[PDB]
Amino acid sequence: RTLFSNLSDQDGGAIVAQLTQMNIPYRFANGSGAIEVPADKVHELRLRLAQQGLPQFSEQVNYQRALEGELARTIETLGPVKSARVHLAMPKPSLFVREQKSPSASVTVTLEPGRALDEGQISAVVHLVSSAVAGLPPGNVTLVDQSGHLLTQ
């Protein structure tokens, strides 16, 4: 299954280097800028790579919803995470001409009783989400737990 698509050559190369190091089989889709990898490893690998810093309405909505769902699924592969919800809020093509807008994301996680996300895991989530959405800076990702505690500084 596709690990990543639409990668820069630089990111692609970095991702391939990491996969080789981890001894994970991979197949870079020919001229598809995509890297199909073991289906059962896709989510774990996305997270791991994120930790290393790598890399119509209805459709949009659907797309957005699909993206949200995928991101949630990936985040749920983290050990301490029981469930995750991702909400993406990219304003519709800035109607206002002068004012400038920017995409943001809100991530809510339900943690396993007695478990917490560490700083690394938190950073991985933030990176994963930011990388998935064009123009979404890490700073515009808010990560909260079930109790509403802000995890991202």
Binding site: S147, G148, H149, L150
Partner: peptide
């Protein structure tokens, strides 16, 4: 410049007070 920093400071304070209220009002 400085006004934006002050406004962000106010926004963070308000958000944290909001979260503290929500934390006890949730259970």
């Amino acid at each position: 410049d400085l006004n934006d920093a002050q406004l962000k400071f106010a926004n963070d304070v308000e958000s944290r007070i909001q979260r503290r209220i929500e934390a006890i009002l949730s259970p």
